[PDB]
Amino acid sequence: GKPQYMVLVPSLLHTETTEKGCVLLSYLNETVTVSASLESVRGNRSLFTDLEAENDVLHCVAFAVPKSSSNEEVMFLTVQVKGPTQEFKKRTTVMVKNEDSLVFVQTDKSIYKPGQTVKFRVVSMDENFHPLNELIPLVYIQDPKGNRIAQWQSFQLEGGLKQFSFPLSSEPFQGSYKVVVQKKSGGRTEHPFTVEEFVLPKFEVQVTVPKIITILEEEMNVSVCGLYTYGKPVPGHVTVSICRKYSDASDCHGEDSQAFCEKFSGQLNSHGCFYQQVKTKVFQLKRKEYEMKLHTEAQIQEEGTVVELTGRQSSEITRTITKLSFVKVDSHFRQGIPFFGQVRLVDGKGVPIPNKVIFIRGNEANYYSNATTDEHGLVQFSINTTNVMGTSLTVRVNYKDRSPCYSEEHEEAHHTAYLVFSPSKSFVHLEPMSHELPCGHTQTVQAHYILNGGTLLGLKKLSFYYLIMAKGGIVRTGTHGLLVKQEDMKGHFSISIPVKSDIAPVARLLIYAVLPTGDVIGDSAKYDVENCLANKVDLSFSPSQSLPASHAHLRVTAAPQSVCALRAVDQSVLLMKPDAELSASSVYNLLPEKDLTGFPGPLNDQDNEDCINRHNVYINGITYTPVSSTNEKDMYSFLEDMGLKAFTNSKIRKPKMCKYFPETWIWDLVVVNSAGVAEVGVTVPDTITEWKAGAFCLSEDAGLGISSTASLRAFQPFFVELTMPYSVIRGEAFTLKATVLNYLPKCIRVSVQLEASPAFLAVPVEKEQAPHCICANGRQTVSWAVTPKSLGNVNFTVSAEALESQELCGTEVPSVPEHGRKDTVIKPLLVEPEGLEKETTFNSLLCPSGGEVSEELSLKLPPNVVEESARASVSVLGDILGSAMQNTQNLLQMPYGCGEQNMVLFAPNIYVLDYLNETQQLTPEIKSKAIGYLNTGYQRQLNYKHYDGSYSTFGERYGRNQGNTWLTAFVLKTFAQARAYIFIDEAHITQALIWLSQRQKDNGCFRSSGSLLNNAIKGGVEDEVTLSAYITIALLEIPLTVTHPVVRNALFCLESAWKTAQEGDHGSHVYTKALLAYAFALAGNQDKRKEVLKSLNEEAVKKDNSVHWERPSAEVEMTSYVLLAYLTAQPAPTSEDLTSATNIVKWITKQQNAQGGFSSTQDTVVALHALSKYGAATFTRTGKAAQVTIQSSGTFSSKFQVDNNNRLLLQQVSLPELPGEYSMKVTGEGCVYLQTSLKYNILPE
């Protein structure tokens, strides 16, 4: 028959990973060889790869491509054939992008105590989950503000798992922390963990309210169990509530934002938890509702009165009922072989309804069948295939459009099966599957086929091919031969495929059969697969062990000679805030490109080959230009949805014309000895609750696996627990609550005592110390009014034991059951100083600037400060402004719109570009992307001049004869700054200047004559003083001497207007005064600059060691301008200038928002310009060295080295001394910001 070649590769070639490839040869009368060459566009980088080919049977090849300098290069793949019979060449560009290798996170908990450390392991592995060694360049921890407490430079991952033991300071501030592991390929990956002060609770509430609820409902089930230790609910005054939230919940933030709830409360006996039946009258789902959130408080009364606000929102309203859903339906119906659709009836809740008659919209042949549901609500129906283009299948249950005002109907099932292009009237049917593929448990896949006079030369041997793709690449292959010498009809061809970890959550199967007529038939099928892992891991224990059962053998089974990580925490750790899952496809969703939906490359758009014309009418009757505008499903459908390139000699296309510290538990590393490893982890002598754990071992042979959560039921028949707050004031007294628990069946009496220490006082609240009647499943609760004396953390001790052989209340009196009789607990408690706490700040800036500066620490304490309440901290920052740095890069946006609109869009592009350039943090790729936006914005603005430069919204368009004044000054400023990047024609800004000079009366100074629709770009108040001061700084920022007449006449108005706003209303003109400050600063009028800046400082609003202004919307605008005023000095920006300048920068960074837009146009413009100038005046191109040494006049000094690569790091030290006997001398290059603060307490008044 006719020869044909067949080779297939995925069109998202990952750089480093060897991507598999398929070769296939069909009907050649000699052996030939084929070589695939990876040539590159516009550059030279080739990968010649000769892959062997067999004339009848296929095999697989692998080729690894070099790492690309560019991130996503779209380069060619040239598949070539050497052979005397034929020399075939097809070439398309597929993709190469450097794959960001997956990176995990750890850090056991997301709530940490102040004096608690973080262990922080991290795992980085590529698509094939056996890991690789990667040089991670940076990993650091960020505070709520944007500071980096710790930082690690470049390091290598020997095995792919590194622990980073970092301790916190004494009292790190507590809003929320987060950790960033920035991969060497740019885009960082983050993970937070909040820090706060607390006391860990034990009881978990699990209210089982139906998450699924009908729109027609009456009864609400709920049960409230608390298994704080082992399932011993110790029923207390538990209260729950069902809170339906109204539509637009809390969208109206005026005088009312509350939602109506339905509270419930009660107790329990021993085992039944809480059985509350809730009616449905205000459980109104008729209209205006989103979801019932539920918050519960399981107060315990038989112990300390600690309450835990616990909100479980596991309840949602379902708008629909009787949900109908296709589960196993062919998107590929085929003329000749009928298809059967598996449609499923199920309630809107999720329970199928058996024996319900259903009507089916078969829009093909009017196939209306009254099928009824089975026990699973799942029917069967086949539709014969005699139609034109494509069948639409839909289901019927109700027809009803009911009373609703304008929400209550039953959701229907829609599907659009499309025909497969059968050129030789032939096609292969492949059975789809809906159930999740079991792992290990394999599965055979049924298939069907048809010939219709195709196999003329093909006879007695028809191999039947398949290529499973997973993770966006070819994974499994196979073949099977068919014995046919006939005109063979449909057949049953179950094909077997095992299911190992090498299958992604998606499993895609393609089957194509080679035919001697050239044309080939195929069928694709997606398969959802449970995410399984090559290393099945199990966690073993010596469970139900006592708290002092020290040995506590921890056995873990994993792949032979692997590396295992073992995290062990408390159950409360997962209770107070659920931590990262790190399990059950936690890696799989982070996997980039889990499937290839289409040709993944956005640049990979189209293909064009063998386009026929055929624009002629043919055989009549109803020719209608012979064929339907094919929405048909040919092989590009089966291979693009597959996601790979078809390098075929076959014709395929559509023709297509034109007790000790718990705090944690086992966190270590263990190595499998080719059979599995046990670890002897000493269990903590504290009995609090279950200890969940993790196990995510890695190996080079078998990939990563994740085992399970498995606990240690650390329980004692007799123990105590302490109910405390996290801290308490020294001057005040709290009441310690301590309960003593008995659960061994013997009925006993406990004597409870507190061993007092001179660090505190403790007095029982009860007059009598006689032991009370405590028995099985019963507890006593004693108290102590406790006031501490010693500062810092002090650990208490409470001793409870059963008094031996005292015939008492209990009918039987076996007081001491076991060797364990005394229960001595040791638990710390934070002790904060008394009085009102005040913190001052001594923030400052120093620049050695190729030399040396100095500063003396003036630290004094008022006499009313209590003893040892002063905590002095000095922080060395560097501060290249890493806070408002990353979000700024996303202000580079596309220019469009009117003249006014374009300035919203074009202007920020240039100042963000200048900011990134000043901070030395800008990549050439983003610079090239942004320069295009700059040019487009500029050359779209050039289409709005009326004349020499007078702009407006419409401009010369529509024959408008008018002109805006302020907008022209704004564009003059922007182009003046542009001259340094794209060298905007100075003739244009010159013409704009000569037009602005037209608006110049004697001393009136630029009355506005402009009309504009919006005013958000604005921010001057149109007052002649305000506009004059802005336009002067605009047309003087461009290098323009003060002797020039326009600025000379503007400065007279400035001097008169500043006096007039000084003699008149004090304040009320702070924005104008800041503009005057910047104008005088940039015009060299220092003798007036000092006076204006001191007036502003008198009018300033200083809050949290950061100075701000505001009108007594655009409040940030004047802050940036006064920052310029303090920064722009003719001789040099003095140290005193910069020290006050930083106090405005901090809020300018914190004003950022989504994509760092700074909430406005003009504000973003001015703030980015301000930050750029600050960076220019602060940083150093050659700042490769520095030195900061703070010398005490007492005992010890401190030293620091903050160079450019460490300039982000907030190096912080605390020097204990109340007097200011401290001094800093800073030498070397660069600039060093030093913020110093002390916290102290003053009780009296």
Ligand SMILES: *[C@@H]1O[C@H](CO)[C@@H](O[C@@H]2O[C@H](CO)[C@@H](O[C@H]3O[C@H](CO)[C@@H](O)[C@H](O)[C@@H]3O)[C@H](O)[C@H]2NC(C)=O)[C@H](O)[C@H]1NC(C)=O
């Ligand atoms: C983007 O890069 C810079 C900001 O990150 C800045 O250009 C820099 O400005 C300095 C200061 O004048 C210049 O350094 C050179 O200045 C003159 C040039 O003849 C000479 O004394 C020395 O050769 C000195 O190196 C440079 O022009 C430049 N420095 C750099 C890039 O290290 C501008 O914001 C932007 N510059 C460009 C070219 O786009």
Ligand SMILES: *[C@@H]1O[C@H](CO)[C@@H](O[C@@H]2O[C@H](CO)[C@@H](O)[C@H](O)[C@H]2NC(C)=O)[C@H](O)[C@H]1NC(C)=O
């Ligand atoms: C079989 O061997 C013959 C030997 O002559 C070759 O026939 C060539 O077939 C191709 C079609 O694929 C034609 O383009 C050439 O013109 C043929 N050769 C000549 C000399 O005419 C070829 O090696 C093999 N052909 C087939 C169809 O398998």
Ligand SMILES: *[C@@H]1O[C@H](CO)[C@@H](O[C@@H]2O[C@H](CO)[C@@H](O)[C@H](O)[C@H]2NC(C)=O)[C@H](O)[C@H]1NC(C)=O
């Ligand atoms: C559609 O249903 C009809 C019978 O219900 C069948 O179609 C017949 O097909 C034969 C030959 O294939 C023709 O001679 C008849 O004229 C057809 N009858 C009708 C009513 O179309 C067949 O069972 C179904 N069609 C297919 C392709 O399976």
Ligand SMILES: *[C@@H]1O[C@H](CO)[C@@H](O[C@@H]2O[C@H](CO)[C@@H](O)[C@H](O)[C@H]2NC(C)=O)[C@H](O)[C@H]1NC(C)=O
């Ligand atoms: C906690 O109490 C103990 C004594 O009651 C002191 O520190 C402990 O001393 C024992 C003595 O062997 C050690 O085994 C423990 O490890 C110590 N505790 C810690 C946390 O290390 C001390 O009075 C208290 N500790 C603190 C930090 O307040």
Ligand SMILES: *[C@@H]1O[C@H](CO)[C@@H](O)[C@H](O)[C@H]1NC(C)=O
């Ligand atoms: C590609 O062509 C350039 C052209 O000068 C040559 O320098 C280079 O060595 C060639 N090979 C590679 C791998 O770049």
Ligand SMILES: *[C@@H]1O[C@H](CO)[C@@H](O)[C@H](O)[C@H]1NC(C)=O
């Ligand atoms: C919900 O409460 C009703 C009220 O009696 C009861 O019949 C039903 O069994 C309860 N549901 C469950 C799951 O127990």
Ligand SMILES: *[C@@H]1O[C@H](CO)[C@@H](O)[C@H](O)[C@H]1NC(C)=O
């Ligand atoms: C069900 O079959 C057809 C399809 O709707 C309908 O005409 C008929 O009346 C129904 N009942 C029976 C007994 O066929």
